[PDB]
Amino acid sequence: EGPALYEDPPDHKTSPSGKPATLKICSWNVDGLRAWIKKKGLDWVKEEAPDILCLQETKCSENKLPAELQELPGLSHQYWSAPSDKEGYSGVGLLSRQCPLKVSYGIGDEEHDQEGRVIVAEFDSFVLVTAYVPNAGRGLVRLEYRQRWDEAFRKFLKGLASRKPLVLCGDLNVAHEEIDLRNPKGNKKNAGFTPQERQGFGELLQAVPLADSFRHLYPNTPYAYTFWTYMMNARSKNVGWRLDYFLLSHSLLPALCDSKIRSKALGSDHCPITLYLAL
DNA sequence: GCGTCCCGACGACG
DNA sequence: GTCGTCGGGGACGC
* Residue A173 marked in a binding site: yes
Nucleotides of C under 7 A from a protein CB: 1-4, 7-14
Rounded distance, CA A103 to CA A210, Å? 21
Bridging pattern class, strands A92-96 and A102-105: unpaired
Q: Is A94 left (phi over 0), alpha (psi -120 to 50) or beta?
A: beta
Resolution (A): 2.7
- Any idea where the domains of chain A sit in the sequence? 1-279
Query: Is there contact between A30 and strand C, defined as CB under 7 Å from any strand atom?
Result: no
Using the 8-state DSSP alphabet, how is residue A18 labeled? S
Q: CA–C1' distance A232–B9 (Å)?
A: 9
Number of other residues whose CB lies within 10 A of the CB of residue A117: 27
Closest nucleotide (C1' vs CA) to A86 is: C13
Which residues lie closer than 8 Å to A128 by C-beta, 6 or more apart?
A25, A52, A54, A94, A100, A120, A121, A122, A167, A169
Query: Is there contact between A116 and strand C, defined as CB under 7 Å from any strand atom?
Result: no
* Residue A48 marked in a binding site: no
Burial class (CB in 10 A: 0-12, 13-18, 19+), A101: exposed
Q: Is A172 helix (H, G, I), strand (E, B) or coil?
A: coil
Closest nucleotide (C1' vs CA) to A134 is: B6
- Domain A1-279 fold is Deoxyribonuclease I; Chain A (3.60.10)
CA atoms within a 13 Å half-sphere pointing along the CA-CB vector of A1? 15
Q: Which amino acid is at A206?
A: Q
Phi, psi of A195 (to 5 degrees): -60, -40
Tell me the CA distances in angstroms from A61 to A34, A124, A230, A236, A265, one per residue in order.
10, 30, 25, 32, 25
Cis, bond preceding A219 (omega within 30 deg of 0): no
CB A58 within 8 A of CB A30: yes
Nucleotides of B under 7 A from a protein CB: 5-10
Q: CA–C1' distance A222–B7 (Å)?
A: 20
* Active-site entry in A132, A225, A245, A276: A132
Number of other residues whose CB lies within 10 A of the CB of residue A185: 7
Closest nucleotide (C1' vs CA) to A231 is: C9
Is A171 labeled as catalytic in the residue annotation?
A: yes
CB A25 within 8 A of CB A169: yes
Query: Is there contact between A186 and strand C, defined as CB under 7 Å from any strand atom?
Result: yes
Query: Is there contact between A88 and strand C, defined as CB under 7 Å from any strand atom?
Result: yes
CB A188 within 8 A of CB A214: no
Q: CA–C1' distance A4–B6 (Å)?
A: 25
